Methylenetetrahydrofolate reductase (Thermus thermophilus), 582 residues
Amino acid sequence: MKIRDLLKARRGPLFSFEFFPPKDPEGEEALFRTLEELKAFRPAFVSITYGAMGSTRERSVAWAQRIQSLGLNPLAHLTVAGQSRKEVAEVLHRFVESGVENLLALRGDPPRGERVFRPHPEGFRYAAELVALIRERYGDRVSVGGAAYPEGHPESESLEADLRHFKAKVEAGLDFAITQLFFNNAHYFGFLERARRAGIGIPILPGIMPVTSYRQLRRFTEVCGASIPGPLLAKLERHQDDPKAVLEIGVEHAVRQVAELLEAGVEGVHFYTLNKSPATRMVLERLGLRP
Amino acid sequence: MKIRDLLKARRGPLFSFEFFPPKDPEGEEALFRTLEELKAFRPAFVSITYGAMGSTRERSVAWAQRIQSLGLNPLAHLTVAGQSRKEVAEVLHRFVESGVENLLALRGDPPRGERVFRPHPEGFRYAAELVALIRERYGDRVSVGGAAYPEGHPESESLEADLRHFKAKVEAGLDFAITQLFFNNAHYFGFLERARRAGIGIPILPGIMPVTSYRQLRRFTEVCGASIPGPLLAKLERHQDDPKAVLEIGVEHAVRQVAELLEAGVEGVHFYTLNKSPATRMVLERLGLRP
Ligand SMILES: Cc1cc2nc3c(=O)[nH]c(=O)nc-3n(C[C@H](O)[C@H](O)[C@H](O)COP(=O)(O)OP(=O)(O)OC[C@H]3O[C@@H](n4cnc5c(N)ncnc54)[C@H](O)[C@@H]3O)c2cc1C
Ligand SMILES: Cc1cc2nc3c(=O)[nH]c(=O)nc-3n(C[C@H](O)[C@H](O)[C@H](O)COP(=O)(O)OP(=O)(O)OC[C@H]3O[C@@H](n4cnc5c(N)ncnc54)[C@H](O)[C@@H]3O)c2cc1C
Ligand SMILES: [Cl-]
């Protein structure tokens, strides 16, 4: 089921989960359990993450298929970094032909260290280019999506620039967008108004991550340039050594974030689960989104 | 000399500094040193903080007359916390008979560690009430600013309510607003849009604090509810013990910030100094201003 159509016909908002393809049998088993626990909430879509450089190629496809057989609806991430144009098309073809209908077109970061983006000698440079390619080969047979950044991409010269670019990418052929994570809703509302004023009208879904680790939260935000509210930061720091206390703080945080997000009429919420179920499960249950 | 008038007639952006009244001789001659250093930057106004719960009002009156007399242009802070209305009026009147033409009508906070605000038995409850009072007794003989919160006042139950209440605070009689500190310009641009969309057309000035102390940053943001970008936080974290590295970090960040703000044409920037001069000096100079 195309997400363009899922969004149009919405009786209500769409809740989606994000997962990454496990590196080892353990993780594979942790994911199987996670999907079981979560498929109960009846998500509109389910994302399968993609290793930049295309290292995890056959995993991402396998799991795209693993979710299909659970009767859920997959969203295939696809990046352009470290890959030829053929190589990017080949795996797109591999998705479509696995029956996948929904694609997040992403560029991907540069590797560890390495501060600037240099493409493959025959690869793409921007996500807008993969979106363009998708529409050119598949038109509307697939629903394409992209990344938005409420607090701006950490590489961008300005916020002016970051948004003009977001717009170019939408004009390339996006049907929706999902945001990078954010912990205070002003950041989303902020961006949404600024986008709509730029005459960008596609559905823009907030991405939410329920905090489960002080160390991870710090390390994640350092990479993607998101900011942690000072009260949350201190709360977490005071309790960082007690994993079940942290889980409760991250949940209470998400619950109250998501509750206003719903009250404000967002089209849906995309959940960064990190392949675990307790946090997202608890958030949804407290919101009354009843199994 | 009224900020309302200075804003209409502004040659370039209005730079301004915030100060608090010191507790002992040591911090007083420290503030005169800082006033001596920063005043060559020809600021449009200089603001002095208030107030223990009025407990330190003699000090703010003393400094408001002291900055007037240096031929700098005073913006006198006034809270309603822990005082009856009559009391709040008397002090207001001591400012205005001093020659002060500019007032920042504020509420003040509860004691550290209490969540709910509890007014004085015979006191005001909202900054707005102070605005109204000032306008009742002094019409437009003075100019009145109030605070704006780009990431929302912590006490506010929704971001739609915080704005709704800010606008009411504007319609009470505001000429300008100054924002609480932010470390990513998205917070501010986002807020500006939302406010115009709500039809608040007054000048809203970004308030910037160049980070000089890691623990200090961590304590203030916990209280005030602002967020710290991931990259900055890990940067500071790395170098927290070397004060002059941290100073270097806070400066390159605030420069990056103020530069873009100026290039987008804000009417001015308001600088949280902590009564120290180097950080703000360094930002203005790197920005190409001459002492
Ligand atoms: C929901 C979501 C899912 C993600 N999934 C993955 C994943 O599965 N695998 C993975 O590796 N990463 C993933 N990422 C991370 C993403 O790959 C990185 O943030 C990457 O750095 C940017 O991706 P992008 O598609 O937004 O890049 P782009 O949209 O191409 O932007 C790249 C940079 O160039 C700028 N730009 C755009 N167009 C132009 C132009 N024409 N001229 C000059 N500059 C331009 C943009 O401002 C930006 O700074 C995800 C991110 C999000 C938000
Ligand atoms: C630029 C700036 C300068 C500052 N200077 C000082 C200072 O000198 N001394 C000091 O102690 N503190 C100072 N502060 C801190 C400030 O006092 C605290 O943040 C205070 O808690 C906020 O009060 P306020 O004046 O902004 O607004 P308030 O109007 O007093 O807001 C308080 C709460 O009530 C809500 N509210 C407003 N009106 C209504 C209503 N009609 N009905 C229901 N709810 C309502 C608001 O959303 C908010 O959550 C300053 C803050 C800023 C941003
Ligand atoms: Cl000194």
